[PDB]
């Protein structure tokens, strides 16, 4: 890999610089290089990995949605034929998005997840695995769509089981996991009632644990609780 | 839109 | 080139799609491919070329400034040594920025400018040549800095001479050219009085020609006049 | 900041 000659610490330092410069493709490449050094990642390093790829795939998803919408309208009754260009370019973006998801999933499988023993790291990585299978599911149309969905579900489910056993209901990773699994139910699995129930139970169990927290931890937890509430308001 | 969340303090 | 197998019309269509998707690197690559077909560009096609590369180089310039600022502070009295990473990464971004500028300048030189006979096309391309030499000048530090500055000046000057002879004072390309040459004087050439004088004369000569315009042309011209006024307010 | 201008209607 092109980062093989750079020190781990220098890759981490440059990932932080790239974040400040809003150079998220660079940030992801630096963090990929850091992961490939083979050592476990610290809490801060895991955050850098997730932020980097969130922003890269986020640009691709937003572009894919724009193009998909244009493509669907071109398939409307009365739309003038414009040739293969819209489909071709949507396919190009889609292929690049799938490639980014495959890269992230490959880092998790080789070998972040298997080396992650603490609940905080293992849940973090399993949530990521669910997230990137979910992004694959958003664009999937063929004979593996069901298997992609089930892969997202299984990763999220293993993460939920660990987080319920090992983390308090206000833990921000536990909360963001439940939030995203709820989005999976609503947007991917066609299970809006499951989505609503999970978001409500997660919110209520967190509210009841807030009294145990410091002011700073309270701020961290209530921020993600507000996102659960925002979804519930949209969905009900 | 985006109703999800991914970098914790 | 990787776009050599795609139809010119398909490249233009995909550049417009990439703009809608905010995929500006793709947009620039599609327009580079279109230029390399060897035919002159229409007014709309010239706009697509300029928008694409403006956005690509704009991201690089913003990142370079962030990194340069971090690098300068690390060179302050009392700043703890952090190693070569900041300089290395600033250099990486700088090299990629220079590469984009070189690509644009190469398209103008081979062979957009020499084939451009109408005032509207020739002034448009010469303005671009000034702009991309100016971006090179923003990061230049070595023994060619003066020659880079003089290259920007000469392109801008040839564009100004043609635009004054061949275009009305309200023409939007003439106005944006004068705006950017004024920025060149202020930010690059250390000539703030020239910058102010050019912006004031350009604004006043446009104001006196507004009465000749349609409502739509009036809107186009006054938008750029407002940018001249904004600069004058900042500079005086 | 940016006080320049580059896509005319
Ligand atoms: Cl394509
Ligand atoms: Cl670097
Ligand atoms: Mg080492
Ligand atoms: Mg028709
Ligand atoms: Mg119901
Ligand atoms: Mg349940
Ligand atoms: Mg042809
Ligand atoms: Mg010290
Ligand atoms: Mg004076
Ligand atoms: Mg003069």
Author numbering:
A (entry chain B), C (entry chain B): -4 to 231
B (entry chain A), D (entry chain A): 1 to 9
Paper text:
As a selection target, we chose the hub protein 14-3-3, which interacts with a range of disease-relevant proteins including p53, Raf kinases, and estrogen receptor α. Considerable effort has been devoted to developing modulators of these interactions, which are generally mediated by phosphorylation. Here, the combination of large library diversity and non-canonical amino acids led to the discovery of high-affinity 14-3-3γ-binding peptides that utilize β-amino acids to facilitate a binding contact.
For use in selections against 14-3-3, we designed a library based on a fixed phosphoserine, flanked by eight varied positions. Among the 14-3-3γ-unique sequences, seven contained a C-terminal motif: (β-homoserine)-(β-alanine/β-homoserine)-(4-nitrophenylalanine). Each of the putative 14-3-3γ-binding peptides examined exhibited low nanomolar affinity for 14-3-3γ, with KD values ranging from 3 to 19 nM. The non-canonical 14-3-3γ binders were found to compete off BiExoS with IC50 values ranging from 78 to 530 nM, suggesting that they indeed bind in the canonical, phosphopeptide-accepting binding channel on 14-3-3γ. 14-3-3σ was used in place of 14-3-3γ to facilitate crystallization, and retained most of the binding activity for 14-3-3.12. 4-Nitrophenylalanine6, which was selected along with thiazolylalanine and 4-fluorophenylalanine at this position, makes hydrophobic contacts with Leu218, Ile219, and Leu222 of 14-3-3σ. 4-Nitrophenylalanine9—the residue most conserved by the selection—participates in an electrostatic interaction and/or H-bond with the εNH3 group of Lys122 (N–O distance=3.2 Å), and makes a hydrophobic contact with Ile168. We speculate that the β-residues conserved at positions 7 and 8 of 14-3-3.12 provide the backbone flexibility necessary to accommodate these energetically-important interactions, which were not identified by selection from peptide libraries based on canonical amino acids.
